[PDB]
């Protein structure tokens, strides 16, 4: 491999330069129109994520079937932690796009979205309270990619790469002047958020499957492929 030979700073720089761009949405809202904008945006963000995954150190070492598996299991989590990250400097709001900043009231336009909305908002408030940093964020996102599907459906490599990111996360905290105790405490606090992020994704996955069955809006074929993997 080559991801293991990387130092902590090189790992961080690699992840930072791999960061996908912030996309814009198209153009009051209805259920159909809001779902339209969100479906379009998610579909385009997905294309960039898949590109980003190939730049995550160690992800290319995996094989195609395994890459597909991790991406299929983690795609909504990755979209969600990205959304939550953008919305950090906008309390009480979710920044889907620069030209699409929404609140929980607007999340009521779509039936059953306000619940997931509140959870997303709660995660952003958690990130803001912990003062989550960009370097910590890009580490968490890659951890999700590698962790989330590692138990289902080679594994030694991923766990070693996962260990590398842990070393990277600690190294970042050591630079910020955090003590020994503060270091593993923050490390724990960060990783526990991944549990709720997993929860949101499963809840979110249910919401999209019903929207598919409600046929209210046609979804992307890519979006349908990713959504059928969770069945």
């Amino acid at each position: 491999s080559l991801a293991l030979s990387l130092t902590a700073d090189q790992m961080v720089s690699a992840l930072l330069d791999a960061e996908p761009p912030i996309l814009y949405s198209e153009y009051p809202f209805s259920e159909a129109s809001m779902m339209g904008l969100l479906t379009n945006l998610a579909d385009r963000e997905l294309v960039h994520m898949i590109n980003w995954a190939k730049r995550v150190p160690g992800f290319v070492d995996l094989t195609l079937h395994d890459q597909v598996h991790l991406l299929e299991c983690a795609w909504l989590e990755i979209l969600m932690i990205g959304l939550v990250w953008r919305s950090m400097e906008h309390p009480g709001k979710l920044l889907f796009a620069p030209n699409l900043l929404l609140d929980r009231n607007q999340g009521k336009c779509v039936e059953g979205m306000v619940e997931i909305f509140d959870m997303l908002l709660a995660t952003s408030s958690r990130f803001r309270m912990m003062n989550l940093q960009g370097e910590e964020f890009v580490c968490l996102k890659s951890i999700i990619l590698l962790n989330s599907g590692v138990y289902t459906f080679e594994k030694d490599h991923i766990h070693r790469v996962l260990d590398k990111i842990t070393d990277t996360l600690i190294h970042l905290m050591a630079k910020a002047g955090l003590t020994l105790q503060q270091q593993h405490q923050r490390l724990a606090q960060l990783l526990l958020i991944l549990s709720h992020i997993r929860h949101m994704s499963n809840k979110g996955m249910e919401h999209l499957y019903s929207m598919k069955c409600k046929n209210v809006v046609p979804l992307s074929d890519l979006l349908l492929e990713m959504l059928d993997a969770h069945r």
């Binding site: 898949i50 590109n51 995954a53 190939k54 195609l64 597909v68 991406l71 890519l222 492929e225 990713m226």
Partner: peptide, 9 residues
Amino acid sequence: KILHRLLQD
């Protein structure tokens, strides 16, 4: 199917 192509490029 689609995910395959986007990864192979």
